Symmetry: none
Subunit: 214 residues, 4 copies
């Protein structure tokens, strides 16, 4: 009942931060400034958890192929898990929004057990900032916002979801079981014509996830 994923590998793993930038036309200081806050913030938090943070964006069409191909194919046998953070903007013209759906399909697709043997039995954690339906065994999908739900909008200090996620990560990252921590993020954000933003997470993990130190 208390079984945990075995996190005792040489390397924690790769924390991948994907930035969705292309097909977004017109970007206020806030969108531009707030995205950096999120990326820079996440990198700090995920590094302190022992991840090899790697960041890129889809603007570099040539660079994206090599980097995407490099990560998918690299061997994760010495690693505990895999993390991917998909960041995106609020305005979202339709091509922008639509591209995102396709990018996430493909991204998630690379690591399904069939494509990635090094990660079989290991946690694959996708953290999505929306502008869903995919999966495999040992996948964890975390959404900035559930269905049809209102979204926080990007501030110059980053977005609510990423701000809070990182807040919790710094404080409780090492101590708490991950889903336990995500639930905290649910409550944190949902409390930030008025209603609420309610994040979600879909778990196909089969055990507990802790990020104790090393």
């Amino acid at each position: 009942p208390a079984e945990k994923y075995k996190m005792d590998h040489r390397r924690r793993g790769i924390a991948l931060i994907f930035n969705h930038e292309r097909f977004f036309w017109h970007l206020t200081l806030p969108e531009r400034r707030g995205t950096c806050a999120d990326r820079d913030n996440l990198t700090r938090r995920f590094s302190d958890l022992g991840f090899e943070v790697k960041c890129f964006n889809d603007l570099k069409a040539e660079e994206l192929l090599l980097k995407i191909h490099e990560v998918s194919t690299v061997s994760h046998a010495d690693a505990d898990c895999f993390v991917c953070v998909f960041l995106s903007h609020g305005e979202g013209n339709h091509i922008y929004a639509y591209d995102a759906k396709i990018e996430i399909q493909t991204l998630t697709g690379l690591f399904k057990g069939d494509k990635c043997h090094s990660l079989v039995g290991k946690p694959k954690i996708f953290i999505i900032q929306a502008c869903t339906l995919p999966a495999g065994a040992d996948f964890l999908m975390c959404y900035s916002v559930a269905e049809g739900y209102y979204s926080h909008r990007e501030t110059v200090n980053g977005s609510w979801y990423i701000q809070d996620l990182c807040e919790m990560l710094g404080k409780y990252g090492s101590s708490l079981e991950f889903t336990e921590l995500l639930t905290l993020v649910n409550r944190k954000v949902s409390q930030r014509i008025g209603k609420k933003q309610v994040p979600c997470f879909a778990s196909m993990l089969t055990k507990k996830l802790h990020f104790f130190p090393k």
Copy 2:
């Protein structure tokens, strides 16, 4: 606040609703019929022992379904901790059968969105779906995007429920059910904002 829990100290635990999807299904082998009864009877035992008022019905009763569905949605849940709904279904699934189910679940879940149900605002709404959101919702799926003694998922869920139901945090328990079944891949989507225990 990290260990904050939903407040389960109400007069009544709540209604465990077991919905049986039967209509638009044809040629049901005895494994189908007796297996389904195993699931329903099993779930009722487990959920009652957790203090739920188990209520069962099926969609064959077209006249009975409206009144009953109607009854539950409108009833006041202010004295209750949470709400549970189990959607049971069969494997063969002709297309009308499969399609009906999608619609039944939409509607069912729809009734309890905070908007429609004030008594349950801030309280857990737990939907357990056998395949063929809002704040404080918990969706559990027999299978992700993928027997005469009942089905694997319901058999294991109930197994875990009996053993660890009172002790464990619910999602902690569901994860156990993920491992259990995947070794005979279920899923669960959580929009809960706190911990869920079903202490006595």
Copy 3:
């Protein structure tokens, strides 16, 4: 390696032993007489539901005590997760009564030190006392710390055993044991201008859960 737990997956959970210290107590109001049974009966319910083979005796039966004591000591615990011992006693405590108790606990605890009991080596030995003895993998729980006030026995049992059992029933299966004992510390220390503060000394090397 931080979340390591004692392995509780044996055929039998183990023996929960309830020792009743009765001899050399002259007296015994209805409350002491009645409250002790509450504690024993209560503890038996709670410890059985955790899978223990509860065994009760008292030191009045001087002949029966020897056979029962060494017998528990000598029996093989290889199929068992752990061992529990509850030492119950009264409040008035003339000096011979109080002194006898010290000696009974020494001896009791002594039987299970790894040297005497190979079946329990590496396994939790939990003594609940109603001091300084020990060994590796021992857990000592005291009704009251040093020099502190004690509950007094009511007709419904004592504060410490009432609360311990309360927590045991509710959180016994869920919680790590020491996590649970700490709850008992807070529970009892708030019962009511005197304060009773329980204690527990841990030489456990891992976590203790009593999952079903």
Copy 4:
């Protein structure tokens, strides 16, 4: 059930490191060199947990009075908790060993709720390296012992002692994450495998954590 001590104060608190030196005659390089390892090591670990580490020894008989009373009387209202580490040597002539018992009595005595209102309801954590008896207490006290009763103690090396080496090892790695007693148990296993069996006596009423600030 998951209630925790409130660690959200302005200051974490004072980590006090008391060094028992007097009445110890003749001290090998290892005892001398190993004690500094322990003190220096503990200071690093306890500072990173936000403590105001203060060290002194009983050699300075004049300095000890001022420093001891000073700490006792200072106001801890802006603090989460209190820590005290009692360090000592292995050879231990009888006057040395006996003095220690008395020093610990007094030390612990200062912070009992009656003497110290600023700490009422707050954790008082005493970590003792042993050479009158073990047990003293009050509500919300946590007593940690290098070694249980009569059991073997594993001697001071030039790199410090086993207990302090391991305690600090765990502190650095798990100090912020884990509930303290959860962490001390880890120290029990760590040292007992280097038998030497540490102990801890808890009268804490809540959980625990030393999250950052």
